[PDB]
């Protein structure tokens, strides 16, 4: 990433996006 300001606030959308993709793989059927 090189847009400055926003590399923390992005890492955190990644991550918390991970885990809502862990989570509808191995658990959950809609």
Same mark, same amino acid.
């Given at each position: 990433?090189?847009? /400055?300001?926003?590399?923390? &606030?992005?890492? &955190?959308?990644? !991550? &918390? /996006?991970? !885990?809502?993709?862990? !989570?509808? !793989?191995?658990?959950?059927?809609?």
């Amino acid at each position: 990433m090189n847009r /400055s300001p926003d590399k923390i &606030i992005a890492l &955190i959308f990644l !991550l &918390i /996006s991970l !885990l809502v993709l862990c !989570l509808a !793989l191995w658990q959950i059927v809609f």
